[model samples]
Target: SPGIWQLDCTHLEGKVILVAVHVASGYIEAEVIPAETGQETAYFLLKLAGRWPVKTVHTDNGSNFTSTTVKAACWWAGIKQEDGIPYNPQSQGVIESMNKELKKIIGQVRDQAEHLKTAVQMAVFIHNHKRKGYSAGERIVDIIATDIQT
Candidate 1:
């Protein structure tokens, strides 16, 4: 089964950005979320839904992920929800690792750039195209092609 995991967010100046990773493919999806509410999480999730069907969503016990709004939205969409151990982010190892990489990228571009969103988008593009010594985008495309062929 495919996995949906929410990664840690780093602050850009005073704003927070959200990240979600696909477990099998290491695909990264991110956005600048203005609020820490379930609505924002739900919106991001739905945006992801446009690209791929979400099967299972694994998240920490953040209010945004655990709220009734998110739960109902996931239920309505037939997405399974799983929670990681409280204070044990390592349980979601894939995204936790990705978060570390993202933070490094953010740090590198934070000082020289005026637009945080543009910097993050560039970083995410690079990350998705090349990860773990492989092209994540190519791998995902191949996976889709194979699935279609079979």
Candidate 2:
């Protein structure tokens, strides 16, 4: 199985930053948008597959993820989107942590909307490059490799 994929969003300086994570691998993909809307989020979701295998997306009950546009995007991509409390609220545990750190890092870096976007993109790049202990010495590069080995 590919593992659990989740989507999360938060605001920084009035701009919205959308995030997605692979729980098992701790891999992250995120973006900064001027606004939060189903259309924007749907397009963002569509781009996730170019860099990784995205079989599903788990998200909160936010209307942006649950709206018609996102559903149509998932259908077009042949993926799935899961929503709601999942019998609890803090279901987005990894995202909550990651985004919190992201906000802190980007907040200190300076001004300019373009700069914020640049900082966020690089932050996630560093995150994906760093080795994750929770997954037992797994690096995103290693995980992305081994396709030809098999």
The candidate scoring highest on lDDT is: 2
Q: What is the C-alpha lDDT of each candidate?
A: 0.70, 0.71
Per-residue alpha-carbon lDDT of model 1 for 28-79, expressed as tens digits? 7888766557877776777776677677777545675668887877877777
Write down the TM-score for model 2.
0.78
RMSD per prediction, one decimal?
3.1, 3.4
Candidate 1: give its CA RMSD in angstroms: 3.1
User: With candidate 2 superimposed using the best TM-score fit, by how many Å does residue 43's alpha carbon deviate from the native?
Assistant: 0.4
lDDT of 1 at 45: 71
Runs with alpha carbons beyond 4 Å of true place in candidate 2: 1-3, 84-90, 111-114, 132-150
TM-score of each: 0.78, 0.78
Tens digit of lDDT per residue, candidate 2, span 29-79?
889899878988889878986567677788644796569998998888877
Please give the lDDT score for candidate 1. 0.70
